[PDB]
């Protein structure tokens, strides 16, 4: 019933390692399965970026 | 309106320009809509309400 998305402020995205940190973390973090989802694909794509 | 579509604050998707540089004259999208419907033509008013 909740999902949840990343935030569009400047600034920390141009930061790199704490992008690389949370693509690091993301993955064990939440889930996107095949029967739930607690993420929008544009979060996924951005942490599959990252 | 051509201006709202071509930019982009999130992750950019894929965008097919036509052969003539009016306005709202390009393909955007995985699914390529067109958006050369939404240009003004007062014959039939294919962009605009009726």
Same mark, same amino acid.
């Given at each position: %019933?909740?999902?949840? /998305?990343?935030?569009i402020?400047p600034?920390?995205? *141009? /930061?790199?390692?704490?992008? *690389?940190?949370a693509g690091?973390?993301?993955?064990?973090?939440?889930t996107a399965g095949?029967r739930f989802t607690?993420?929008? %694909?544009? *979060?996924a794509? %951005?942490?599959?970026?990252? | 309106?051509? !201006?709202?579509?071509?930019?982009m604050?999130?992750?950019?998707?894929?965008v097919?320009?036509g052969?003539?540089?009016?306005?709202?004259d390009?393909?955007?999208?995985?699914?390529?809509? !067109?958006?050369?419907?939404?240009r003004? !033509?007062?014959?039939?008013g294919?962009?605009?309400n009726?």
């Amino acid at each position: %019933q909740i999902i949840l /998305d990343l935030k569009i402020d400047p600034g920390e995205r *141009m /930061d790199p390692a704490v992008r *690389m940190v949370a693509g690091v973390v993301g993955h064990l973090l939440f889930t996107a399965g095949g029967r739930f989802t607690n993420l929008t %694909q544009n *979060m996924a794509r %951005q942490l599959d970026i990252a | 309106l051509n !201006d709202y579509l071509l930019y982009m604050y999130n992750t950019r998707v894929q965008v097919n320009y036509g052969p003539t540089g009016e306005p709202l004259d390009f393909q955007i999208g995985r699914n390529q809509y !067109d958006c050369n419907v939404f240009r003004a !033509d007062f014959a039939t008013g294919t962009g605009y309400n009726g």
